[PDB]
Amino acid sequence: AAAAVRNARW
Amino acid sequence: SRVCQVTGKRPVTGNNRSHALNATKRRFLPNLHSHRFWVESEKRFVTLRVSAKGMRVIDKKGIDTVLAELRARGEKY
Amino acid sequence: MKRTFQPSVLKRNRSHGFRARMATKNGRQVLARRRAKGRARLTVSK
RNA sequence: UAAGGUGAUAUGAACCGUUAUAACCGGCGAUUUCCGAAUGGGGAAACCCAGUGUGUUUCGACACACUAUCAUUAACUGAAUCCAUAGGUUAAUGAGGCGAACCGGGGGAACUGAAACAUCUAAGUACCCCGAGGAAAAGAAAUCAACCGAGAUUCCCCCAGUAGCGGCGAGCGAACGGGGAGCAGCCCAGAGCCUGAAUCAGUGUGUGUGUUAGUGGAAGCGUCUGGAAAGGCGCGCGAUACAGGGUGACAGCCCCGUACACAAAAAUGCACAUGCUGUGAGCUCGAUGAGUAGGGCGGGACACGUGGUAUCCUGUCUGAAUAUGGGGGGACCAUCCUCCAAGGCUAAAUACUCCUGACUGACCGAUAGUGAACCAGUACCGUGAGGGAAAGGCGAAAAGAAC
RNA sequence: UUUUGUAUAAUGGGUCAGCGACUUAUAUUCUGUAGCAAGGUUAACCGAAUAGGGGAGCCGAAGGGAAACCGAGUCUUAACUGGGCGUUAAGUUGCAGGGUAUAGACCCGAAACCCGGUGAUCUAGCCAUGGGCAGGUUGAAGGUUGGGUAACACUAACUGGAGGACCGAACCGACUAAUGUUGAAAAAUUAGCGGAUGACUUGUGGCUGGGGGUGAAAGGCCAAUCAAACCGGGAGAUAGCU
RNA sequence: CGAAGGUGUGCUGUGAGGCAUGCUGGAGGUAUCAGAAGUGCGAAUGCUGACAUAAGUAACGAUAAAGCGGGUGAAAAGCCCGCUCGCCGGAAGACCAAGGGUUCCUGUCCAACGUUAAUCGGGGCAGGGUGAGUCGACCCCUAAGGCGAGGCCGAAAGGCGUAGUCGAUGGGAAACAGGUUAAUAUUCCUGUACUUGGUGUUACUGCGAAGGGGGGACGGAGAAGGCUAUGUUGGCCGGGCG
RNA sequence: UACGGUGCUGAAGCAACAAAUGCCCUGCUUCCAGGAAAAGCCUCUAAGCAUCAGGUAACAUCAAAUCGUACCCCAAACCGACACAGGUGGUCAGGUAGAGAAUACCAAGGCGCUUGAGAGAACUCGGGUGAAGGAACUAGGCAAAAUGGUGCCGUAACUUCGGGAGAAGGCACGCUGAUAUGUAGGUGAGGUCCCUCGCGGAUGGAGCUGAAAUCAGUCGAAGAUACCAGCUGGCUGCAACUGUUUAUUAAAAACACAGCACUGUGCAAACACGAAAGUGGACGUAUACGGUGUGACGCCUGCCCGGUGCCGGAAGGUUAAUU
RNA sequence: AAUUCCUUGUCGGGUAAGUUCCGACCUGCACGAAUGGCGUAAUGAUGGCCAGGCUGUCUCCACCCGAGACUCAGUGAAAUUGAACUCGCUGUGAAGAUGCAGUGUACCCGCGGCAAGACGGAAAGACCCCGUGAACCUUUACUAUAGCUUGACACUGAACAU
RNA sequence: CUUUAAUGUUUGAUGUUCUAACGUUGACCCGUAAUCCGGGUUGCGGACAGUGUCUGGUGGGUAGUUUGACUGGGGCGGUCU
RNA sequence: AGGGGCGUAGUUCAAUUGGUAGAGCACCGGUUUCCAAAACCGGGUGUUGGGAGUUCGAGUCUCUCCGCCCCUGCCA
Ligand SMILES: [Mg+2]
Ligand SMILES: [Mg+2]
Ligand SMILES: [Mg+2]
Ligand SMILES: [Mg+2]
Ligand SMILES: [Mg+2]
Ligand SMILES: [Mg+2]
Ligand SMILES: [Mg+2]
Ligand SMILES: [Mg+2]
Ligand SMILES: [Mg+2]
Ligand SMILES: [Mg+2]
Ligand SMILES: [Mg+2]
Ligand SMILES: [Mg+2]
Ligand SMILES: [Mg+2]
Ligand SMILES: [Mg+2]
Ligand SMILES: [Mg+2]
Ligand SMILES: [Mg+2]
Ligand SMILES: [Mg+2]
Ligand SMILES: [Mg+2]
Ligand SMILES: [Mg+2]
Ligand SMILES: [Mg+2]
Ligand SMILES: [Mg+2]
Ligand SMILES: [Mg+2]
Ligand SMILES: [Mg+2]
Ligand SMILES: [Mg+2]
Ligand SMILES: [Mg+2]
Ligand SMILES: [Mg+2]
Ligand SMILES: [Mg+2]
Ligand SMILES: [Mg+2]
Ligand SMILES: [Mg+2]
Ligand SMILES: [Mg+2]
Ligand SMILES: [Mg+2]
Ligand SMILES: [Mg+2]
Ligand SMILES: [Mg+2]
Ligand SMILES: [Mg+2]
Ligand SMILES: [Mg+2]
Ligand SMILES: [Mg+2]
Ligand SMILES: [Mg+2]
Ligand SMILES: [Mg+2]
Ligand SMILES: [Mg+2]
Ligand SMILES: [Mg+2]
Ligand SMILES: [Mg+2]
Ligand SMILES: [Mg+2]
Ligand SMILES: [Mg+2]
Ligand SMILES: [Mg+2]
Ligand SMILES: [Mg+2]
Ligand SMILES: [Mg+2]
Ligand SMILES: [Mg+2]
Ligand SMILES: [Mg+2]
Ligand SMILES: [Mg+2]
Ligand SMILES: [Mg+2]
Ligand SMILES: [Mg+2]
Ligand SMILES: [Mg+2]
Ligand SMILES: [Mg+2]
Ligand SMILES: [Mg+2]
Ligand SMILES: [Mg+2]
Ligand SMILES: [Mg+2]
Ligand SMILES: [Mg+2]
Ligand SMILES: [Mg+2]
Ligand SMILES: [Mg+2]
Ligand SMILES: [Mg+2]
Ligand SMILES: [Mg+2]
Ligand SMILES: [Mg+2]
Ligand SMILES: [Mg+2]
Ligand SMILES: [Mg+2]
Ligand SMILES: [Mg+2]
Ligand SMILES: [Mg+2]
Ligand SMILES: [Mg+2]
Ligand SMILES: [Mg+2]
Ligand SMILES: [Mg+2]
Ligand SMILES: [Mg+2]
Ligand SMILES: [Mg+2]
Ligand SMILES: [Mg+2]
Ligand SMILES: [Mg+2]
Ligand SMILES: [Mg+2]
Ligand SMILES: [Mg+2]
Ligand SMILES: [Mg+2]
Ligand SMILES: [Mg+2]
Ligand SMILES: [Mg+2]
Ligand SMILES: [Mg+2]
Ligand SMILES: [Mg+2]
Ligand SMILES: [Mg+2]
Ligand SMILES: [Mg+2]
Ligand SMILES: [Mg+2]
Ligand SMILES: [Mg+2]
Ligand SMILES: [Mg+2]
Ligand SMILES: [Mg+2]
Ligand SMILES: [Mg+2]
Ligand SMILES: [Mg+2]
Ligand SMILES: [Mg+2]
Ligand SMILES: [Mg+2]
Ligand SMILES: [Mg+2]
Ligand SMILES: [Mg+2]
Ligand SMILES: [Mg+2]
Ligand SMILES: [Mg+2]
Ligand SMILES: [Mg+2]
Ligand SMILES: [Mg+2]
Ligand SMILES: [Mg+2]
Ligand SMILES: [Mg+2]
Ligand SMILES: [Mg+2]
Ligand SMILES: [Mg+2]
Ligand SMILES: [Mg+2]
Ligand SMILES: [Mg+2]
Ligand SMILES: [Mg+2]
């Protein structure tokens, strides 16, 4: 599994 | 459990209605009460778990007659 | 780092052993299903 | 039944048999460790610890048997409390659990559809629980009809997607009547006169027909190709047997069978007959299911969602008539028909297949068909419930390659 | 493939082989075809049985009207010269096909809802019974002996050893930085850091179960999964979307 | 006298295709006209298997450290022996519990396993190995808690619970030193002890409960004092004269 | 003799000192938060035996079953898919230095971590040193550097009088000799007295062990020389504080907290878990318990009852089942 | 001011220069008294600011010691990948070109390096929107319901007084 | 008819006193080696409490859902015949 | 910016909401007091922000235009 890389563009 | 020892009445299930007819499951239980009945033949008090409808039939049928049916039923009064 | 499995034979048999499973009908239904399925090992007991 | 045989991978060794005590097959028995309803107590299943009694002795012990709980019945004893009763101790029977689907009953969803969503639908479905049988359930009119009649229940095809039900939306959906399958009627609510009548259930006793091992079972040679013939080319024969399988390539006549004809010491199914043990048939006169029907309230079931809603079931509160009487005929009343509830029993036609045998397929042919053609519910994964694979083919014969 | 429009720097595909998606049942309408024809045809069932029997029924030859009714007419109206719907026109039963309807209905895919079970060997809290905390400091109350008071109070010295006290290993925590980011490791290592006799820590058992638990409270944790666990079932839920 | 299948070639039709042949293979195949479909695949981040690509690139797992001689062997940086060097030493040593299940010892072998080679191994194969009155467990006893006759309650299932019965992580009788095996030892051997029951003999004799009492029997912290384990030094004994 | 080994023989085998976290000690002292059970064991008598049985004591004798026992056990054998820089409870605790189980170097013992050999580029990681300047860097003194021990002197605002405080700041530390050839102290033999007599008491001081201080001398750039081992001060926001929390990007001003107040609750308590029985609350009783908000302490907590809740009232209006 | 939008408010202190900090002012956009107000020693891996010491943090990097990187031998992955004979520029073009047009340049092929591009790799975009999607949560949204509470009847009777 | 005074009746409204239903998580006895349960004795309470059916009120405590579209992205605003 | 509200006597507010604008204070005049005020009597005051439209007629109704208030300018 993984943890959604918070490289999030908001 | 909630069982009448004379009539055999037991809980039954039904629906709560509403002004919108919404139906929710419910239970109807008998009006059971523990009563000490005086049996003349044995000059003793025997306690029975009876419904209110069962109380009426005891007067009509006699205390001895109902117990005779109970012994046939093997209810172990 | 401590993981989810710490072996303990006494705990394992008291939780999932043959007598623990068969004590109740729900566990007895597990045995019935495993007997119907044909499992080689019915319970966890050795 | 037998000349071969000690299951398989899987050889070998040591042997046993050959005309009937080898082996193999079937019937009936004997043995049947431990765990498991598990039942002497306990317990982390396949383990731990006893008690009683009988009988053994080498005086260290040892071997059997019995000892769970509950229900029913019968004895004996036995409180508060004088009798009693509860309770207690024995002894007899019976039940416990498991198992595919089908069946009856007790409970009982939601997703979904309505292009949302509450009524409704899904659906009394999934699931849980209880109980029973080879079937279950239902069943002998207080039924329908319509002024003519039918005559228990169950199942099939119609009636009919009709009449109706329904936020009259989605949807749900009869009955009457008709054609079929199959048909069977009885008992108590009580006493006589008759009398053991019919009938049913137990059991023995035979017959018949199965089932559980088996027996016989017809008829082809030559030549050619070829490693090998069952193929080619010739000439035959059998067939109540040309169903299939095997045999070195495609076999009616090589083998196993098949068609037919037969077989049972013993056990057992089914049916008929018959003998005992119960069981009562018939006639007369009576009797005719009361906290019930009905009603009020709240729900549910009838296709029918309260609607003008009959009918059925009742949680609650009431409560009749009773043959000179009641129920029903879809609100209700009258008339008229029809039936007699509040006690029971009942085969067949119907549903299903865990399992047994035979046979069939315009079903599959190893990524298909059961997950599994293979030591598969295995390996493996998961604390656990549970999930769950991959993997078939040498050749006719292992002759499996001496050196 | 999707689009008004893609060499497009939009989606899809490393390649090969195998597998992989408009089916089935019933009903209905239409077309084609065959048969019979103002008739056509049976269903269940019977049946040595794909025959034959069975016409129970169904459709059609007559419609109009809400209906009673009337009828090649009928309804509307008091009535129609009227008007609406009908009256010359062949249907029916198979087979195949095109649609529609009910079923999963061309295939694959939800996040979820509901039902019955499995999990507190991880973690959270609690319960019972055991264990652990080197060493070094600070020196409370109290006590004794003096000094002071009428007696206290008070004070000094000496004893004492209090604390969710101090510094600091084990132990426990996890604040900063670097590395590591297909790692030695699905959360760690190295150098520092906080607590370290307590609201401490730990071993072995036990108890609380899913709309529930537990929570010094973050929607945290409840077997690497938590704004409602996991497993099976309803279930091929549904998906106007791709 | 070579079927399907595969692999070439030639011819042929508007196309999906068809025909024939050489080779492979070694036993099936099937005209024609009809009938029925699991009837045609390149894509669905499709499914399964096989094989590429990056690529002989990254990595070969703590920077505690190796070196040499000899031996065995087909082959030695990695195995054995020896001599040095380095690392841990409140551990990176020794003994256990929990847990694992033969990994222990010996012989033999190097396909696979070991991130290299391997003669070696916790790998493969074949043998051997675990000896208890005192150590544990079992047993007696109870804690939390579980189960629970009857009982109470609950649609059913079931829930709770009394008497009871289970349940250690706690309480209960007793063994030490020495020697020995390739691998076991408070278990075997040697030496010297101890405990609880049974039976018998002898003597003296009030015994006795599911009952009563006592005991078992219990905290935290702190302070010393007396000791031992153990260590150091001296003495003694043996060896050494570098 | 097979490098093992096997067999035989085999000296001394004492004393002093130091000393535990082990033992006496399940003790003693003290404190508040007031600290299992049962059985074995000892004893007492009931009923039931008191010739018996049974009990006590001494011998002899039997019996003590069954199961585990190898090996790993902070790890290559267990939990982590791995021969995985992780995790895993108990017991044992050598020498020198040191307060110490820290740390450094060693003993017993066990290992060098299952790819190496070269080369000695950039760059990256872990480290060492650095002219001069000394935060000019950077969001930020992040990181690094620095401080670091014992003894003594000395130590401010403020304070709840405890603190702040190791405040800051400073001095002395090696070795040798002397005081005193090995001191003060501790330990304590012989000897000599005493004993209703022993593992005795009192003297006695041998021998061991042994700081600390001062003085003198001496070496080095440097004597807490290594390892080990606080950076400090000033102003201010928030929270009183120790503690707890998002296992796996947030440890905080968030949560908890003692304290305070309101309110419910008379015990078959309220409340909560349970269709119910029952249980917890509690074997407690308003000096108790539950809920809510606030959050030590100090000074304090003002005005509004219209709205919404809650409490009290019950005359009237309205109003269900029922009749 | 953890609260001040205007705003770097104004003044003072600290600095050579201070949108932060400290002291005041009050004009409180939009503090305020147990959803506590104001103070407060001690405590804090608490936030902000300042000073001394200290240093490669920096001016401005240099050298050195190790582990990789590089070479040789052995073993031997991975994400990705429509196919490639895989240049620059300007223009065009599903509107930012290795692939089109024009033009320029370029012998074939490794190795060590740097990452500008291949709208590079990872993961059917978390922001935005949509669906008559899902879930939790709130309330004086709707309809219900457990619970609580009211009364009638039943269990449930007698006598007397008004 | 109104006004109605009294008269019995039929329903209710309270209040008081009883016990016999019912309650007892009061005491005592027995089952009994028993803090359960049951039975007995007694005391207290008592036609209440409590429970059943029906019914009014309350009820995010717990559920099932709804919460529009157009729109030079959406929301807000505006609009819908 | 966008949207709602407001403008009436000297200052603060009523308004009728199609046909004739009031209240409080302030101001003025007269009483009372030695005097001021407090008190008493009496009374005058307005283009209803500006404009343009409707209407026979507007401060009122409609639309712009000034001034003054109150709200919004949000998700990446
Ligand atoms: Mg048994
Ligand atoms: Mg819907
Ligand atoms: Mg049968
Ligand atoms: Mg034969
Ligand atoms: Mg009758
Ligand atoms: Mg009704
Ligand atoms: Mg109507
Ligand atoms: Mg209606
Ligand atoms: Mg009706
Ligand atoms: Mg009735
Ligand atoms: Mg194949
Ligand atoms: Mg398949
Ligand atoms: Mg298969
Ligand atoms: Mg295969
Ligand atoms: Mg592309
Ligand atoms: Mg791709
Ligand atoms: Mg046709
Ligand atoms: Mg026919
Ligand atoms: Mg007819
Ligand atoms: Mg006409
Ligand atoms: Mg069709
Ligand atoms: Mg279709
Ligand atoms: Mg502390
Ligand atoms: Mg500390
Ligand atoms: Mg990084
Ligand atoms: Mg601290
Ligand atoms: Mg988790
Ligand atoms: Mg949910
Ligand atoms: Mg599931
Ligand atoms: Mg469904
Ligand atoms: Mg689906
Ligand atoms: Mg074929
Ligand atoms: Mg060919
Ligand atoms: Mg062949
Ligand atoms: Mg297909
Ligand atoms: Mg395509
Ligand atoms: Mg690959
Ligand atoms: Mg290489
Ligand atoms: Mg490369
Ligand atoms: Mg490279
Ligand atoms: Mg490399
Ligand atoms: Mg290594
Ligand atoms: Mg070597
Ligand atoms: Mg060392
Ligand atoms: Mg092995
Ligand atoms: Mg070994
Ligand atoms: Mg090899
Ligand atoms: Mg091995
Ligand atoms: Mg022994
Ligand atoms: Mg043994
Ligand atoms: Mg022992
Ligand atoms: Mg029971
Ligand atoms: Mg229980
Ligand atoms: Mg026990
Ligand atoms: Mg124990
Ligand atoms: Mg051992
Ligand atoms: Mg004490
Ligand atoms: Mg000693
Ligand atoms: Mg060993
Ligand atoms: Mg390890
Ligand atoms: Mg892992
Ligand atoms: Mg492992
Ligand atoms: Mg540890
Ligand atoms: Mg150390
Ligand atoms: Mg280098
Ligand atoms: Mg760097
Ligand atoms: Mg440095
Ligand atoms: Mg140097
Ligand atoms: Mg410098
Ligand atoms: Mg310098
Ligand atoms: Mg700066
Ligand atoms: Mg700068
Ligand atoms: Mg820092
Ligand atoms: Mg440093
Ligand atoms: Mg300070
Ligand atoms: Mg500030
Ligand atoms: Mg704090
Ligand atoms: Mg975190
Ligand atoms: Mg934590
Ligand atoms: Mg953190
Ligand atoms: Mg607070
Ligand atoms: Mg109020
Ligand atoms: Mg008020
Ligand atoms: Mg600001
Ligand atoms: Mg300034
Ligand atoms: Mg300020
Ligand atoms: Mg505030
Ligand atoms: Mg206040
Ligand atoms: Mg307040
Ligand atoms: Mg803290
Ligand atoms: Mg600070
Ligand atoms: Mg500084
Ligand atoms: Mg390219
Ligand atoms: Mg370009
Ligand atoms: Mg361009
Ligand atoms: Mg390259
Ligand atoms: Mg680079
Ligand atoms: Mg780069
Ligand atoms: Mg929408
Ligand atoms: Mg809600
Ligand atoms: Mg729904
Ligand atoms: Mg919209
Ligand atoms: Mg947002």
Side-chain angles (χ1 to χ4, degrees), chain B residues 2 8 15 24 38-39 41 45 47 49-50 53 58 60 72:
Chain B
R2 284 177 181 110
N15 288 322
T24 56
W38 170 256
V39 55
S41 57
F45 270 110
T47 321
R49 190 177 182 87
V50 187
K53 182 142 181 93
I58 299 298
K60 189 211 194 168

Side-chain angles (χ1 to χ4, degrees), chain A residues 1 4-7 9-10:
Chain A
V5 173
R6 309 216 49 85
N7 179 359
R9 2 170 178 179
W10 296 69

Side-chain angles (χ1 to χ4, degrees), chain B residues 3-44:
Chain B
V3 182
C4 173
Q5 297 194 249
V6 177
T7 68
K9 284 162 173 278
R10 54 177 55 256
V12 300
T13 66
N15 288 322
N16 283 25
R17 283 303 168 178
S18 64
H19 197 61
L21 278 298
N22 302 111
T24 56
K25 304 301 288 292
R26 70 156 295 181
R27 295 170 72 236
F28 294 91
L29 71 164
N31 193 359
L32 290 173
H33 297 275
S34 177
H35 198 90
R36 302 178 295 110
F37 297 91
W38 170 256
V39 55
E40 182 34 44
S41 57
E42 284 88 3
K43 74 172 221 198
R44 219 173 43 241

